[PDB]
């Protein structure tokens, strides 16, 4: 519940 | 070439709803986080919901969560903002943002910023 | 909620000159700190991100400073498209902006 891990692919 | 074409903004009157469509062009749009940014007039930024590139997780600002939805549906380049029970104060410029993923010589890897916009579609929420 | 306060609220300069930026986190952001130019009925533009790295397409006359809660953006030389509200942004908690320093051309 962390909104600010990497959203994006290939972290 | 990335661009991000805003559509759907408009007069909304209060309580009811209206949605936000955001098409992506010259980039894999598939592979990013996307977020949505708003701008009262006259007023600063405010961050409002971010989607993962694959859909999965979704975050709000606490004003809107559980009246506004973002989803997105890379099959078509476009991402939208679902805003239900809309209230004056949601009366707004959005944007859609791509989240900047960027990666340096050593690999390393950042996130979490803005790094190309929509032109922005404002909402005029008013009775 | 971390907030970010930028000063001073206007900048009024000339072209050519130095034009220093600050913005102040109630607390450590560590360097995820970001800069936007925001020009009247534009989007914002990405000019720094974590705090010193300047994003692809931005003239080298812009910089960025600083770690923890104080941060600063410097223009070596302002030029005429300079003239802009600039927001700091922060991502280590959520996503808060400061509310902007409005870089006026002086007369």
């Known amino acids: 519940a962390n909104p600010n891990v990497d959203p994006n692919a290939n972290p | 070439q990335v661009q991000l074409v805003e559509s759907g903004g408009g007069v909304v009157q209060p309580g009811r709803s209206l949605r936000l469509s955001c098409a992506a062009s010259?980039?894999?749009?598939?592979?990013?986080?996307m977020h949505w940014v708003r701008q009262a007039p006259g007023k600063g930024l405010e961050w409002v919901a971010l989607?993962?590139?694959?859909?999965?997780?979704?975050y709000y600002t606490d004003s809107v969560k559980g009246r506004f939805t973002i989803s997105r549906d890379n099959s078509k380049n476009t991402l939208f903002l679902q805003m239900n029970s809309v209230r004056a104060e949601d009366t707004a410029v959005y944007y859609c943002?791509?989240?900047?993923?960027?990666?340096?010589?050593?690999?390393?890897?950042?996130?979490?910023?803005?790094?190309?916009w929509g032109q922005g579609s404002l909402v005029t929420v008013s009775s | 909620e971390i907030v970010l306060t930028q000063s001073p609220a206007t900048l009024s300069l000339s072209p050519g000159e130095r034009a220093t930026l600050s913005c102040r986190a109630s607390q450590s952001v560590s360097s995820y700190l970001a800069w936007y130019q925001q020009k009247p009925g534009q989007a914002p533009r990405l000019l720094i991100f974590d705090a010193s790295i300047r994003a692809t397409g931005i003239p080298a006359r812009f910089s960025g400073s600083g770690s923890g809660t104080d941060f600063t953006l410097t223009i070596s030389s302002l030029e005429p498209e300079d003239f802009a509200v600039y927001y700091c942004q922060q991502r280590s908690n959520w996503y808060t902006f400061g509310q902007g320093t409005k870089l006026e051309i002086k007369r």
């Open positions: 989607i993962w590139y694959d859909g999965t997780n979704k």
């Open positions: 010259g980039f894999t749009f598939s592979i990013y986080g």
């Open positions: 943002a791509r989240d900047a993923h960027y990666s340096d010589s050593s690999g390393y890897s950042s996130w979490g910023y803005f790094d190309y």
